[PDB]
Symmetry: D2
Subunit: 163 residues, 4 copies
């Protein structure tokens, strides 16, 4: 068979990367519930290093519950802080991943594959240990890196508009 390099993203790679983020959020949450803040922060660090693209420079990350001065988490510390708190530079952050999450459901509205990147827009439903479901409107953008792995370079999460 002809030796090939495929820098392009497939549908199945995008769907996998969406789930992988869900699994990573939950893994952080159950690890906090079970082993405390220090173990979660260390798990969260490896998760961000793995699934995000802060290595390339800024990530276009607007987290769901980020407050109006510190809205855009363009740095690795900004992401970690949003998910597990424990950073005095982000004093409004208690840790979004620390609410005992257990189930994440992806409901895509549309996917756009532009070759090396892919953008998804739809709903994500995050359910805690007691079945308290939070619905968010989520845009992700994935870049396939030089090692063939999908990295979040864009992450816009918003609570559905009510009024």
């Amino acid at each position: 068979k002809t030796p090939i390099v495929n820098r392009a993203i497939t549908e199945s790679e995008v769907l996998a990367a969406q789930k992988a983020w869900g699994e990573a959020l939950v893994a952080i949450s159950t690890t906090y519930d079970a082993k405390g803040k220090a173990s979660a922060k260390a798990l969260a660090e490896k998760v961000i290093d793995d699934a995000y693209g802060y290595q390339f420079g800024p990530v276009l990350f607007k987290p769901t519950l980020a407050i109006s001065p510190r809205t855009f988490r363009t740095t690795r510390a900004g992401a970690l802080a949003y998910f597990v708190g424990d950073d005095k530079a982000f004093p409004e952050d208690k840790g979004f991943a620390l609410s005992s999450w257990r189930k994440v459901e992806i409901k895509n509205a549309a996917i756009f594959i532009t070759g090396n990147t892919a953008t998804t827009m739809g709903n994500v439903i995050i359910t805690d240990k007691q079945g308290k479901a939070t619905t968010v409107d989520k845009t992700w953008q994935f870049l396939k890196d030089d090692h063939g792995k999908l990295r979040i370079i864009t992450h816009h999460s918003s609570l559905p508009y009510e009024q």
Copy 2:
């Protein structure tokens, strides 16, 4: 003579220009309604959506600021028009976002990612009406440079800043 060259890549200046052109268009639809009423605004909004968005390629990933939780994702031209100018029984909750007498748009980028043929921006956009009432949104755009070298919106996620 200079080497003939095809450039499908987006530059920073093309991205900033396309951001400003969307602002100008929102304001141009808003004044045209204040000045000449619904019909004129609608016809202008239609050319704007045909020009600045990329519904020609298939669905656009458009989550508008003030879109209500059943009709959240405007993946069709009609969805986008309806959001801006209303007047569509299929989007009954849409009075028209562009019809609030908008006069100034300010772009405050936090970050830009140029992935070659496309470019994503994230940051604040501040839209101010004739009375100086400022609406601040958190906005993500993605621009694709079409076969004719013009930047088209294929992704548009706008959200009100989270208030605790």
Copy 3:
């Protein structure tokens, strides 16, 4: 219902298909000349170049196998047509490559690189005439997937194997 999706990426199967379609086209021009003469071949070559190449975007990076050292690079539609079918005073050394009664094209890829919106192939192509005379070339193609999802040649470098 299935999530609506835009796919501007090229797949392996799209690349192999586009390779085979170029072969089929060369053979279809060659037989059409053997069977119906110059005029018919020319009109067919024109639709082939308009279909399979990307002169619509600007220059194509086309270095044909048997192109002579003044007129080496066929960056214009006319250059490409002339190479295949001749009949152009502006390319006086061109008898027409496609007019040698070609009947079989075999693609032997050494490697494929899909860079997302484009895909490059390098390897051998073996073009055999009505008498079974095999011409082997070393060939590089680059395909771009246009706004309509069809693969267009923007790069075509063909060379006779180096003989010491």
Copy 4:
């Protein structure tokens, strides 16, 4: 100023990467003339690691003077062998870089920038220590890697057709 990531290639980046290859060929050639085969092979190894993209998988490399069985140098060893010989697996290779090259001139016919990659097609003129000029027809394709540096993923070199 807004923090930005630019995975796109500019005209000036392509022109630089074309010259950089010229400089690298010559550097190998003068290093052989002056310090012998071992020093050139070691310089040539770092040159290929740097300017080519064998890290991603196969490179679409058809060298000017490569012979009909071993035409396509899809492996790092194939490239090294073509440029400096000294590999019994490529027995027809004496070393293309070992002919005392001194001047390389790029004459582009056309450049196509497809975002993350750029293809050049034109002439390259390589002149030795005595002014013996070899003209080649050259296609290059450059991919900007995750670290912002241009890497040759395609290299088709042919002697101009004579007859």
